[PDB]
Design a protein around this ligand. Structure first.
Ligand SMILES: [Co+2]
Ligand SMILES: [Co+2]
Ligand code: NA
Length: 446
């Protein structure tokens, strides 16, 4: 005689159930997904035999399924898995991601919300998420996986956090240094232009990152040098799996410095020639949010044994990327990206991401995609990103967004920006916790 182990549940950080089993009959255990598609990218689905088919149902199947007993060997019932997700935040973010996808016309949209201090994954969502309460064979038109961890992209100008962090950390510039930024330069044998044409502009270091000057980024990166720049790429976790605890995580791709060509250093600081996942991208800004200490993100908070005893997941080791002073200085600078100016001069690239009364800080991203037919960049196909911190003066949440080639803003207005989706999510996070509420920053001197 077999005594079957009962499958454990999957719950969010507050024990709100995402997946649980009810007993029924044809002896038939039926998996329940009360939220339908809610976080199904993470949770996954069940197979005909009641074991996991994909997602965490599959990757944690041994934990969740337990071991059948016999009569004597006692049945070891499945343990319950406690995720770091907050279902309230997941539900709002997942809805907003879907409508940002409909409104922008992007091929796909994804977003990640991390706790600023611990790096725990509070929300991880993509558009078009499948429904694990329905048979997977009817859902070829749905997203069955978890692109936020599986599908890397070239960061483009969201990668400029690395250059900014390195020039401040090594004492090579300051936010208010007045620079002289030509409209193009030749570097490493190639020519780099700014996304707008201009003669020599007196951007401050703040303005180089606030206006996203490719040329200004590269001039500053020349002060850093290849070795210190590459070292900082690695400290930020790029090119390495985070170990978040989800199946199918990609490591991204960073060319090691001993394989660089003459043009590599002219490309990497502006986010071309390397790739990262949305989670890695968001993890970078968490380092700066956490006063320079990167905590690799985790989605498994704890497991609860059948006797009800809870064991917390072990916290990952810290990585000191920059000093606390550097991190605080970088957060303040990135406030310029969301700064509005009717006269244009002191406006960053993402003013719609700002939330009045809060010190929102972040960075817009644009990156050309690669044309499969030529092995060369598309002229007009982009990954659009936004990464930000709520808030600069008191980091609580880190939010990362990617839009795959939108035709409009995330809210449907003309343009291509992901900044309004950050506005919606960050502002909602502030209001729902009743977070309580200087002079304008100088991006462009005389
Ligand atoms: Co356009
Ligand atoms: Co608003
Ligand atoms: Na990477």
């Amino acid at each position: 005689d077999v005594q079957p182990a009962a499958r454990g549940s999957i719950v969010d950080r507050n024990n709100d159930r995402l997946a649980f089993t009810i007993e029924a009959r044809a002896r038939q255990d039926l998996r329940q997904y009360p939220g339908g598609s809610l976080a199904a990218n993470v949770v996954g689905g069940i197979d005909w035999d009641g074991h996991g088919l994909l997602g965490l149902e599959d990757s944690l199947d041994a934990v969740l399924a337990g071991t059948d007993g016999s009569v004597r060997h006692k049945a070891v019932h499945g343990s319950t898995v406690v995720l770091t997700l907050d279902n309230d935040i997941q539900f709002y973010v997942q809805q907003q991601v879907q409508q940002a996808k409909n409104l922008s016309g992007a091929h796909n949209v994804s977003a990640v919300v991390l706790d600023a201090k611990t790096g725990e994954v509070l929300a991880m969502a993509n558009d078009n998420t499948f429904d694990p309460s329905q048979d997977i064979g009817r859902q070829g038109d749905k997203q069955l996986g978890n692109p936020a961890v599986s599908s890397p992209f070239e960061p483009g100008s969201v990668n400029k956090i690395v250059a900014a962090s390195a020039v401040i950390e090594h004492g090579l510039s300051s936010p208010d240094e007045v620079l002289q930024v030509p409209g193009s330069i030749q570097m490493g044998g190639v020519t780099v232009h700014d996304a707008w044409e201009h003669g020599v502009m007196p951007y401050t270091t703040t303005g180089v990152f606030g206006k996203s000057s490719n040329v200004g980024t590269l001039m500053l990166s020349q002060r850093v040098g290849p070795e210190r720049y590459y070292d900082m790429l690695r400290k930020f976790g790029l090119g390495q799996r985070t170990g978040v605890g989800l199946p199918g995580e990609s490591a991204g791709l960073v060319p090691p410095i001993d394989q660089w060509s003459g043009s590599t250093f002219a490309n990497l600081p502006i986010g071309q020639g390397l790739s990262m996942t949305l989670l890695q991208m968001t993890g970078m800004y968490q380092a700066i949010a956490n006063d320079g200490v990167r905590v690799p993100p985790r989605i498994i908070k704890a497991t609860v044994a059948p006797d009800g005893s809870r064991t917390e997941e072990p916290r990952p080791d810290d990585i000191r990327v920059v000093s606390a002073q550097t991190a605080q200085t970088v957060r303040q600078m990135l406030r310029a990206v969301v700064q509005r100016d009717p006269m244009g001069y002191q406006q960053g690239t993402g003013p719609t991401a700002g939330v009045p009364g809060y010190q929102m800080a972040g960075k817009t991203g644009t990156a050309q995609q690669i044309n499969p037919g030529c092995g060369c960049y598309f002229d007009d196909v982009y990954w659009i990103t936004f990464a930000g911190i709520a808030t600069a003066d008191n980091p609580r949440y880190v939010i990362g967004i990617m839009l795959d080639n939108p035709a409009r803003n995330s809210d449907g207005a003309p343009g291509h920006s992901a900044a309004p989706l950050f506005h919606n999510i960050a502002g909602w996070l502030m209001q729902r916790e009743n977070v309580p509420l200087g002079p304008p920053l100088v991006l462009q001197a005389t």
